[PDB]
Antibody, heavy 219, light 218 residues
Framework: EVLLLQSGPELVKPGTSVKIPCKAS????????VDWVKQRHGKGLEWIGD????????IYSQKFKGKATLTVDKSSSTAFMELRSLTSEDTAVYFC????????????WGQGTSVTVSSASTKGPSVFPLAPSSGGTAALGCLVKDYFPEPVTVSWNSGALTSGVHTFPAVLQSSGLYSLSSVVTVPSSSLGTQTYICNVNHKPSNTKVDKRVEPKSCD | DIVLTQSPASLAVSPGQRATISCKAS??????????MNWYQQKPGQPPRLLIS???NLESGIPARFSGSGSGTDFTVNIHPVEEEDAATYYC?????????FGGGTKLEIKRTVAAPSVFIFPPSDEQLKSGTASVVCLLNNFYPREAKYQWKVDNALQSGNSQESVTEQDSKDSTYSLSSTLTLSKADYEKHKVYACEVTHQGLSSPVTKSFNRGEC
């Protein structure tokens, strides 16, 4: 019903600015205030500001004066937040949330825009197979290595295989490139009846890699 | 600014039992009949979801297992009974005055029964070796508790400082964790040795499980 739609993850360079949208629908846009909340990876929620779409009146947290700017477009029912003079401290997920100007809770949130502030160049990943050698349950996977920035999505057999799939959080290697593994556990008997393909999508570099994971028969 | 002190920072509650999370405010959140205390539930990857507003108004769509109470400066949210889908981080937030402030958050871990991991080891692919780098991966699958002791062994010698790990969030269905460890060596160092092993010690294992492969075989 009520939907707050934010843009997807975005890589931005330090010393620049970025403008994050929050398109509202399913309710009277001018009847609610739009708040913005910052969340660093693994941390809590911190309040950025508040804007009244009826008149454009803004209230900012003191911690974000000069850093964040809140605007609204009533005709398009969209709220915006612009972050200036970007540094690595600004790397976080930014949520927009709906609330009543008068003591209202934040009852509906956007899905959050993950902003990465880095001067590193976009790099597509290499996909290597995690092949098992021939118990009763077998495990196989794909190593998605040396890419930047986050994220990559991994599906198995074009999304037809979902049970038993574990796609781990990416880890930042000392080289400054990310790396993650996606694994799936299947019946050992299915290694000879089913073809297992991991579908890796790296949207920041427009990279789609499909890698068949061929098991090794070993006496 | 109204500072919200949320306790505990974390807690483990078994399914069926009661989880109690508290939030203490630096000043009163009462105002003309209201108690503007709001509780949120945030599961990993998702935005926070409003559970309770006005200190005790359970939002439409939230199960009755959640209940909020309190007034003035001391507030409490209760989960009874705790379910396995309740694995998340919970925040308190005041809407009494500006600036809006959040509590530190409370990570609720579902305390299930002991589960020993299923261990798998993967050799580096021939394709990666062409780049001069060897990545050896060890998988610890569907275990609980989160505390898992594992160690890499190269020709039976314990390794340290040359591996990175990653752990999944607690599963919403079976309340387990999975862990993947990647051992990184140069191709030359990889060719210098034969036996690569992953050794796991866990509460659910009667004896440590070791998975290994020989570099040449298979």
């Amino acid at each position: 019903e009520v939907l707050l739609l934010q843009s997807g993850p975005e890589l931005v360079k330090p010393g620049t600015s970025v403008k994050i949208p929050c398109k509202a629908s399913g309710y009277t846009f001018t009847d609610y205030n739009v708040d913005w909340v910052k969340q660093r990876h693994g941390k809590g929620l911190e309040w950025i500001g508040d804007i009244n779409p009826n008149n454009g009146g803004t209230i900012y947290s003191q911690k974000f004066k000069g850093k964040a700017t809140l605007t609204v477009d009533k005709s398009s029912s969209t709220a915006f937040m612009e972050l200036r003079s970007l540094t690595s401290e600004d790397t976080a997920v930014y949520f927009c949330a709906r609330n009543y100007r008068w003591f209202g809770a934040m009852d509906h949130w956007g899905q959050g825009t993950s902003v990465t502030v880095s001067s590193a160049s976009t790099k597509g990943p290499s996909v290597f197979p995690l092949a098992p050698s021939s118990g009763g349950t077998a495990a196989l996977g794909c190593l998605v290595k040396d890419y930047f920035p986050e994220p990559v999505t991994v599906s198995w057999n074009s999304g037809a295989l979902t049970s038993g799939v574990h796609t781990f959080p990416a880890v930042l290697q000392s080289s400054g490139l990310y790396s993650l593994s996606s694994v799936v556990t299947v019946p050992s008997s299915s290694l000879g009846t089913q073809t297992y393909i991991c579908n890796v999508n790296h949207k920041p570099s427009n990279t789609k890699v499909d890698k068949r994971v061929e098991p090794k028969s070993c006496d | 600014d109204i500072v919200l002190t949320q306790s505990p920072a974390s807690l483990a509650v078994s399914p069926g039992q009661r989880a109690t999370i508290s939030c203490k405010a630096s000043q009163s959140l009462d105002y003309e009949g209201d108690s503007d205390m709001n509780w949120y539930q945030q599961k990993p990857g998702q935005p926070p979801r409003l559970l309770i507003s006005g200190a005790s108004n359970l939002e439409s769509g939230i199960p009755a297992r959640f209940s909020g109470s309190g007034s003035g400066t001391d507030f409490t949210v209760n989960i009874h009974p705790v379910e396995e889908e309740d694995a998340a981080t919970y925040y308190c937030q005041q809407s009494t005055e500006d600036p809006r402030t959040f509590g530190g958050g409370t990570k609720l871990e579902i305390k299930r029964t002991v589960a020993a991991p299923s261990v798998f080891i993967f050799p580096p692919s021939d394709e990666q070796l062409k780049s001069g780098t060897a990545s050896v991966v060890c998988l610890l699958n569907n275990f609980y508790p989160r505390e898992a002791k594992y160690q890499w062994k190269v020709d039976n010698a314990l390794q340290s400082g040359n591996s990175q790990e990653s752990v999944t969030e607690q599963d919403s269905k079976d309340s387990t964790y999975s862990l993947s460890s990647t051992l990184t060596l140069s191709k030359a160092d990889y060719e210098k040795h034969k036996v690569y092993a992953c050794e796991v010690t866990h509460q659910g294992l009667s004896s440590p499980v070791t998975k290994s492969f020989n570099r040449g075989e298979c």
